[PDB]
Design a binder for this molecule. Structure first.
Ligand SMILES: Nc1ncnc2c1ncn2[C@@H]1O[C@H](COP(=O)(O)OP(=O)(O)OP(=O)(O)O)[C@@H](O)[C@H]1O
Ligand SMILES: Nc1ncnc2c1ncn2[C@@H]1O[C@H](COP(=O)(O)OP(=O)(O)OP(=O)(O)O)[C@@H](O)[C@H]1O
Lengths: 150, 370, 150, 370
RNA sequence: GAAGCUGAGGCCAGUUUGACUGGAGGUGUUCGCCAUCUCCCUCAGUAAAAACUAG
DNA sequence: CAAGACCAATCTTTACACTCTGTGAAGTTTTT
DNA sequence: CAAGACCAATCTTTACACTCTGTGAAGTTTTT
RNA sequence: GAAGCUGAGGCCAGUUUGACUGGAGGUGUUCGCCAUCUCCCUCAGUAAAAACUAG
């Protein structure tokens, strides 16, 4: 898979909306003025801020919340298989290892690492962007290399 | 478009008939007298219950139905709100690595009534309901608030169990919800609140939640409208916390996902009940020993059938308890299916316990016909 | 007069630049690439943020400063004469009084107020916009009506 | 383009000839021995002075000229920097309504040398200057730092009066300047620093600067690299503060402009000197009583002319003092003309005192020819 | 002064010549009764809001 | 013990007069 | 006594192999 | 334990039978020697950086 879930809280027309269980083709239908393109705007702003572009923050659904959050759960099982293997010693693979999957396999011990390796691998990377009321943006991961690589 | 209430709004859809006599004779709407309120003691806590026959109960109910349900709230308030649930309070914290839990001491008793007036003022038009004597907002707060006879010094009080008290508490605490949410967001902390229990979680590798500075800052904020932090219930842990039995764990680091699972202390009572059911213990003993439900002899309505009455009552109570716990775990299963954050092996254990509960309820119902 | 001074700190090409003693015609000359239009951009951004428009904050001259400040000192002597007088009781005049010159003559006492009235009147209004490193903007006056009126 | 220093940069333009012998024989650059450093006592403070004949003094001077002058600093640092002056430190606060002043206890002694190494590391290339024994950065810090003989426990120390010590202090404190400036900006406070004296001002109507929370936050920040706040010099006032005689006042409210003026305590000495000059007091008495400058008999170079020598020396010292104070107030006048923030009536008083000073210096010079 | 705490009793066990404290164990641990595996009775009194009736 | 930081909404903000210009002289669980 | 918040710069981040697809079996003032 | 403080003495005045503390007043004030108006001697020792030489 590619994306496990997308969650929007208090941004544009969404109060608390979670989209998950994506398939290969995802047809979006609905009446006029229901937010179908608002998902597009949210994803576009999230990816523009992912590459550290300078853009205006999106508007809050209601002003009685001091935050607006966008959460992306990337599915890195296949990339983990790609990079963890000993054959792929390339420089791009080494960068992906040293940026994403390092400091995450660091905390685990030998038993848990071997359990993850042998069993059905399922690894996710959760990234949350929070827009405060004063237009500041705060990430849940403070390493910009991680965001650019994602 | 915000909700606005005028004289016709109170007289037609709110009052309907509860205070028709006061509005036709232009007589002031009276205080909630002590005759309409009974004082229950539960623990060290004191509950205030209004009588149903009083018009104040009916106007409180229609206030809750039509007025307090439209005022916007803060999304950090997960309690007493349409669609809010405990699992929602405990969910945003699966993304965190360190957890902290704070409590507000006597949240409902410490709500100042003037704060309630200020909070409800923008949503109620400033008019004179009864001549030039009592204003509309004054009449509505007379309906909502109460004067504690035990403690007359503090004056008007929002009591526990006054139907409309929870929604009013959420509305009056929206201000602090906004303040504390802004502070936590600037610190990069996830914040949520259920009634008065506040939960914070840090998704970063840091010791902010375990420091005294965080407690001091939250207390300094809470002192704005006079609240205090219960120092006995303050808790701070890393990588795993347990809140009333529901354990949130997150052993990971960067971009990790935690899991929520009930522990064995939580499932001890239902496991013991199923064990007693499988051991053919009589229903009366099971109901009295574990479910703390007993048939007092003063509650028996008729003396015509009593031996059958007791058996039927205990059968029904066991059925109701089993169905309630079945629906409590079904709620857990539905929450997991919607958000995918409950432990998978704990999901298997839930499935096993639910199958056992369903089989036992089927056996009891089949025996009912024998 | 109209503007007493304009001060820019750490924004665009300016480190700490103060322009004052304006005359009726102010000819700006200088070599190519010296910041002549950067003054335009700074003033334009200050006035766009004055009306609470949503625009991207300007870039910092050097990133070793956590702040970037723009200060405008408006000369309100003539407006004070306009509005303080008892003849002009219009609604626009009343708004200007109740927004700008109220809460400023409030703090003064009778002696100081009479001294200001009788002597050569010289009243200024200083407004400072500070851009933090996280794109938040903070004013030195927290009343948006004041900024819109200015 | 940041400044980078390599082996050729040290050997050609920095060392020139001070350490030619060490670089041609590949001998390690030695520590600054106690023989090159004399220990002066001023007050409870201790100053360390290097001898000029030592090559370390010359390499310190050329380091200051060519290397430390190019590393970017923080604009909140108004001291020891090209173009920085005390009046600049005291100016941004004319816009504030409440003032607070803090001090760092023993700023120069509490600078950790490892922090200096970390701060200078990105600007010096990592090479081996002398074979494989001593690195380039190690040699440069050997030139810059010193080991205190009185207190050998703390090891290498940046001492007071080591030519390059002020610039190094600014560079090593740039980190905290950034941190504290960011915190104050988020709080809406104007912040400035001169050496170790920190000044904060709030332009809003609030009591933030007078609260203990602000001190606690600044101390918590300062503890990151081990500094402390001198609690004796902490000051907080409203609408007017006096810092070493320079008074900043702001009686206004919204959008007001304060004024800076020296007080009478500051001008007491110059007024007394002018008064004594107008009273025909002899020059020796004026120089000894007020200017605390005296001609010690051990300082007389020749015995050929001594009665004339003493008179000429005291005449020159009085001329120099009057010219110095004349230029100090000219600096005040220039600052006022550039920024327009000094009190107008105080500007008139400055003009009067300056005319008096000029007339007295003219009279003394005319008497010199008689 | 501020803070915090729990319904009323009766046998039996542990501490007491005469009354007070608990009524599965194992394992780990941030030592929290916190987490995980396996396997005492009576009598009062018990307000409110929300979630939840697997698939 | 006591304290900075005390929601977001809510209402015609465009000129006056003498002076043609100047402004003035019968379920579970949680909070509890 | 002790603690969250510990600058901003600084270096090829785009594929590998067996597997044609899968990732692996001699001045003043200030700091002082 | 942590914090903070000031060069060495000699007459004269105030507190002490025998040694220690200050050497314009007025006014206001956040009481800080803080602000504003008017009008004791000797002897040591005195590093560094920056601003400033009205117009
Ligand atoms: N800045 C905003 N703040 C709040 N709500 C907004 C904002 N921008 C858009 N909306 C709301 O979101 C909706 C905008 O329509 P949107 O384009 O998201 O829907 P759509 O289904 O894509 O429309 P269409 O069917 O025409 O393509 C409207 O309900 C509008 O009220
Ligand atoms: N975002 C920025 N950050 C830093 N410096 C900037 C930025 N934008 C512009 N500059 C600097 O400001 C100058 C830009 O030229 P500018 O237009 O300000 O001058 P100008 O005198 O108006 O030019 P011209 O004479 O061609 O009209 C350059 O020195 C450039 O380096």
């Amino acid at each position: 898979m590619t994306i496990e879930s997308i969650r929007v809280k208090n941004l544009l027309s969404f109060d608390d909306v979670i989209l998950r269980d994506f398939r290969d083709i995802n047809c979006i239908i609905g009446r006029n003025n229901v937010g179908k393109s608002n998902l597009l705007k949210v994803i576009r702003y999230f990816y523009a801020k992912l590459e550290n572009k300078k853009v205006i923050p999106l508007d809050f659904h209601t002003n009685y919340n001091a935050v607006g959050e966008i959460t992306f759960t990337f599915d890195t099982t296949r990339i983990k298989k790609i990079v963890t293997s000993r054959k792929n010693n390339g420089r791009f693979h080494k960068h992906i290892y040293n940026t994403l999957f390092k400091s995450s396999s660091v905390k685990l011990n030998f038993e848990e690492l071997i359990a993850r390796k042998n069993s059905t691998n399922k690894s996710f990377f959760s990234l949350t962007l929070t827009i405060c009321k004063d237009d500041s943006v705060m990430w849940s991961v403070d390493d910009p290399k991680v965001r650019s690589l994602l | 478009k915000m909700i606005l209430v005028d004289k016709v709004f109170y007289e037609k859809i709110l009052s309907v008939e509860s205070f028709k006599e006061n509005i036709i004779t232009q007589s002031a709407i009276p205080k909630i007298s002590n005759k309409e309120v009974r004082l229950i003691s539960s623990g060290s806590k004191i509950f205030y219950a209004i009588n149903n026959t009083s018009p104040h109960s009916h106007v409180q109910l229609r206030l809750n139905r039509f007025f307090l349900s439209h005022i916007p709230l803060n999304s950090a308030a997960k309690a007493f709100v349409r669609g809010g649930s405990y699992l929602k309070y405990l969910e945003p914290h699966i993304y965190g690595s360190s957890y902290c839990r704070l409590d507000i001491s006597s949240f409902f008793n410490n709500i100042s009534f003037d704060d309630v007036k200020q909070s409800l003022s923008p949503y109620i038009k400033d008019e004179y309901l009864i001549g030039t004597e009592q204003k509309l907002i004054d009449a509505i707060l007379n309906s909502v608030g109460y004067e504690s006879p035990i403690r007359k010094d503090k004056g008007m009080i929002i009591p526990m169990g006054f139907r409309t008290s929870p929604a009013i508490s959420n509305i009056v605490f929206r201000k602090m919800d906004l303040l504390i949410q802004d502070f936590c967001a600037k610190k990069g902390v996830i914040y949520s609140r259920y009634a008065d229990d506040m939960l914070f979680s840090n998704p970063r590798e840091s010791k902010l939640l375990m420091s005294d500075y965080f407690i001091d800052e939250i207390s300094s904020l809470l002192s704005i409208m006079g609240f205090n932090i219960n120092q006995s219930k303050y808790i701070s842990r890393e990588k795993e916390i347990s809140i009333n039995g529901y354990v949130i764990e997150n052993k990971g680091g960067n971009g990790s996902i935690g899991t929520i699972r009930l522990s064995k202390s939580k499932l001890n009572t239902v496991l013991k009940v199923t064990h007693a059911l499988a051991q053919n213990i009589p229903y009366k003993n099971i109901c009295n020993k574990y479910i703390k439900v007993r048939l007092k002899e003063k509650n028996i309505k008729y003396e015509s059938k009593k031996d059958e009455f007791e058996k039927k009552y205990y059968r029904d109570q066991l059925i109701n308890y089993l169905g309630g716990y079945r629906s409590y775990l079904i709620s857990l299963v539905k929450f997991h299916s919607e958000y995918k954050c409950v432990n998978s092996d704990f999901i298997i254990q839930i499935n096993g316990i639910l199958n056992d509960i369903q089989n036992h309820i089927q056996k009891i119902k089949k025996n009912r016909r024998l």
